[PDB]
């Protein structure tokens, strides 16, 4: 069986090699440069005692949720800086948070291996745990709402699952990874999603079928961060190699790599602008670099954090960028 | 230029801030500890006072200690160890009786000690089951020289043979700790029996010294 695997793997390598007639940079060589981009901190959100691990924007583009080591989940009003809610968490170790597309619910995850869904809008006027989802044998690295009922999670079990929150049991499990799944991103159409793992491979997943469509391998080390291009035909990865790579679903291969000899720190986060021309990456070097997605030329730097940047998010309308960090402050950039 | 509803929202935000500050001030008082031992080390048996993560609380001299034990993960710990870089200290428990496991224990200690995130954190090393170690050394059926040739030619700086063996085993870990030489973090070695009246006291003294060194560095005395 192993010998048969090599032939099919060799067939795949020839298939993607044959398609690479032109390079992305060759195609977009005659495109006007975006030039230097400058953004300044419009708002600095204070109130988190300890380091911030994760954040997520609401679809209304004004509210965001953040999770921190101090054991609190806080919903902010970005425009006015006010705190809408502050949720006490049973476990102080929280690796991820999510905000529902409707905004009625938020979710949580961490080393306790349980995903806790919170009901923001309720009679009696307090946030309460609607459901605690159990069934993962490892820490939850990420969680994202498809809708109010359904939520996908990724774990250190090397498995991802689709949960029905009303029933509280998994409806599908995704088992392709050979390492802890660090990140996931949902396609805009929601019919499919990607996952990144310490295996250093990214696999396209079909939510309805429960199978892996494609697998992408270009990273030497773990893939910390994953994001889908706004069109949905491509996605961008972040790893500990201090390089980001753009992959294309249809071509099934790499288009462009965003690497600079100056920087050696790993990429903690990646995000895309609304147009997709800009790729924003968060590093352990206490700063975020803005890349021209087409030309892979650095267009700017966002440096205001005294510690590493845990999370990075771009608003749905694309007006603002929010970056959390281990110094316990979130900054809105514009 | 703020509506009444916006003013009420701001007052609610300020009340939330006050409650968060109170909770943080309450949380600061406890000293947080991390307990790491691969297996057969008696890491649960170290402290007599008491699925993803196990938490233990013991109090000594009106000081609250939090000890976390993460046992639901694989042998590799690179990802979840990032969270525990704010801890006061890391408690490493190793069974000195089993000589075959000692090389793996030394490799684990080196990996923890040289981890980038845990560079600031000091370690408290409990060499455990010293009574079983002494019994094996007196019996002599198991030879330390076979596993580590250095013991066959060693001199000390409880029987003398047992003392030499225990000093040798301690010296390996102390040398791995000394190899860094940074001084920001120090390894405090101790020898613990299977049942010991006081280990929270030792942890308390080591945490007192750990905090004292940080105080000296902050006050620019060093």
């Amino acid at each position, epitope marked *: 069986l192993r010998q048969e695997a090599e032939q099919l793997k060799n067939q795949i390598r020839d298939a993607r090699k044959a398609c690479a007639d032109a390079t992305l940079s060759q195609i977009t060589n005659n495109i006007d440069p975006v030039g230097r981009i400058q953004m300044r901190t419009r708002r600095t959100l204070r109130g988190h005692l300890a380091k911030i691990y994760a954040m997520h924007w609401g679809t209304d583009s004004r509210l965001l949720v953040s999770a921190s080591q101090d054991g609190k989940l806080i919903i902010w009003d970005s425009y006015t800086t006010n705190k*809408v809610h502050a949720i006490p968490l049973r476990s102080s170790w929280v690796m991820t948070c999510a905000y529902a597309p409707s905004g009625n619910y938020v979710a949580c995850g961490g080393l306790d291996n349980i995903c806790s869904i919170y009901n923001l809008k309720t009679r009696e*006027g307090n946030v309460r745990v609607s459901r605690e989802l159990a069934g993962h044998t490892g820490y939850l690295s990420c969680c994202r709402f498809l809708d109010d009922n359904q939520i996908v999670t990724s774990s250190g079990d090397t498995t991802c699952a689709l949960w029905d929150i009303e029933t509280g049991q998994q409806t599908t499990t995704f088992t392709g990874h050979t390492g802890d799944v660090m990140s996931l991103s949902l396609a805009p159409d929601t019919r499919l999603f990607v996952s990144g793992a310490c295996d250093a491979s990214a696999k396209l997943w079909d939510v309805r079928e429960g199978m892996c469509r494609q697998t992408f391998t270009g990273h030497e080390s773990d893939i910390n961060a994953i994001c889908f291009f706004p069109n949905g035909n491509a996605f961008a990865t972040g790893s500990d190699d201090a390089t980001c790579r753009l992959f294309d679903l249809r071509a099934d291969q790499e288009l462009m790599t965003y690497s600079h000899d100056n920087i050696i720190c790993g990429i903690t986060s990646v995000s895309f602008s609304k147009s997709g021309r800009l790729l924003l990456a968060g590093y352990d070097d206490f700063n975020c670099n803005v890349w021209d997605a087409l030309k892979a030329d650095r267009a700017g730097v966002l440096a205001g954090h005294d510690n590493r940047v845990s999370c990075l998010g771009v608003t749905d309308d694309g007006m603002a960028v929010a970056t959390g960090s281990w110094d316990s402050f979130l900054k809105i950039w514009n | 230029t703020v509506s*009444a509803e916006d003013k*009420a929202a701001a007052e609610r935000s300020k*009340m939330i801030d006050k409650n968060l500050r109170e909770d943080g001030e309450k949380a600061r008082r406890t000293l947080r500890l991390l307990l790491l031992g691969a297996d057969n080390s008696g890491k649960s048996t170290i402290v007599k006072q008491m699925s993803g993560i196990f938490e233990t609380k013991f109090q000594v001299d009106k000081v609250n200690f939090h000890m976390f034990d993460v046992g639901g993960q694989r042998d590799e710990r690179r990802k979840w160890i990032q969270c525990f870089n704010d801890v006061t200290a890391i408690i490493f428990v190793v069974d000195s009786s089993d000589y075959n496991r000692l090389q793996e224990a030394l490799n684990d200690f080196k990996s923890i000690w040289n981890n980038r995130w845990l560079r600031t954190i000091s370690v408290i090393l409990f060499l455990n089951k010293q009574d079983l170690l002494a019994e094996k050394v007196l019996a002599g059926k198991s030879k330390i020289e076979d596993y580590f040739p250095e013991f066959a030619r060693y001199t000390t700086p409880e029987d003398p043979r047992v003392t030499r063996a225990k000093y040798f085993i301690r010296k390996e870990f102390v040398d791995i700790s000394t190899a860094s030489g940074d001084g920001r973090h120090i390894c405090y070695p101790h020898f613990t029996c299977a049942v010991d009246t006081e280990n929270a006291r030792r942890i308390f003294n080591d945490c007192k010294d750990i905090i004292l060194q940080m105080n000296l560095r902050e006050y620019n005395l060093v």
Partner: single-chain antibody
Framework: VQLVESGGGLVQPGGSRKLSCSAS????????MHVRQAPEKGLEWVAY????????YYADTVKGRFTISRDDPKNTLFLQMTSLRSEDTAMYYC??????????????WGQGTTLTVDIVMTQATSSVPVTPGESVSISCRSS???????????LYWFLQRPGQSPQLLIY???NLASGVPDRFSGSGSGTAFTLTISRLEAEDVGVYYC?????????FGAGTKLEL
């Protein structure tokens, strides 16, 4: 959730009476608490006590006479009333209101207890003839524009059915309060607002009050009564 008012009955002029509303089933500390209806007049807002009692407001009619206080652990709100006059006779309502981005204040009202002893909001028609199954429209106006710079227009619509407390229908002129059928809609422009009911049915008959929350004191309209 429940708010049960206590105290009332006959009081001589110049006497003092304490009215208390006891809260059960909701987090009393988080909510700010507030309203009286005269025997033959629309609603009038008496006093407000914020969460934590940090902020207090009174109507100019009752300022210097009434005092509003909350004892959070027992979940009770008090109104200490002094120098009662003939005008003070009314039915007093205990109302809860929570203020954050997207909250629906004035959502729940108490039953109320009878006692026997500035933006001008105007409703055009005191009574409007209606028929079952026929769409109707209700109009209210503001002396001053209720649209704030931040973009929210602070207009609220309440419904008081016969023998029942007012119920919130629409908050901030467009949002529909939870538990309300979709038929109700709020279309509004600055200084002029309206409520539209489509497929009107029985049990939706009552006085429709328009309120402004732009600034204190809170003013209620006279209200428009619907009868089949």
């Amino acid at each position: 959730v429940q708010l049960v008012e206590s105290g009332g009955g006959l009081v001589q002029p110049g006497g003092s009476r304490k009215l208390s509303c006891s809260a059960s089933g909701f987090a009393f500390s988080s909510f700010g608490m507030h309203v009286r209806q005269a025997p033959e007049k629309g609603l009038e807002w008496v006093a407000y006590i914020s969460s934590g009692s940090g902020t207090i407001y009174y109507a100019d009619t009752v300022k210097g006479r009434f005092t509003i206080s909350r004892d959070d652990p027992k979940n009770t709100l008090f109104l200490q009333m002094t120098s009662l006059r003939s005008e003070d006779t009314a039915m007093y309502y205990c109302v809860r209101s929570i203020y954050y981005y997207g909250s629906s204040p004035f959502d729940f009202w108490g039953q109320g207890t009878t006692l026997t002893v500035d933006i001008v909001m105007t409703q055009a028609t005191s009574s409007v003839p209606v028929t079952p199954g026929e769409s109707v429209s209700i109009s209210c106006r503001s002396s001053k524009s209720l649209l704030h710079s931040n973009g929210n227009t602070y207009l609220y619509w309440f419904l008081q059915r016969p023998g029942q407390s007012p119920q919130l229908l629409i908050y901030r002129m467009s949002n529909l309060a939870s538990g309300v059928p979709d038929r109700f809609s709020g279309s509004g422009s600055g200084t002029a607002f309206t409520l539209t009911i489509s497929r009107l049915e029985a049990e939706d008959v009552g006085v429709y009050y328009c309120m402004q929350h732009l600034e204190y004191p809170l003013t209620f309209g006279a209200g428009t009564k619907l009868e089949l």
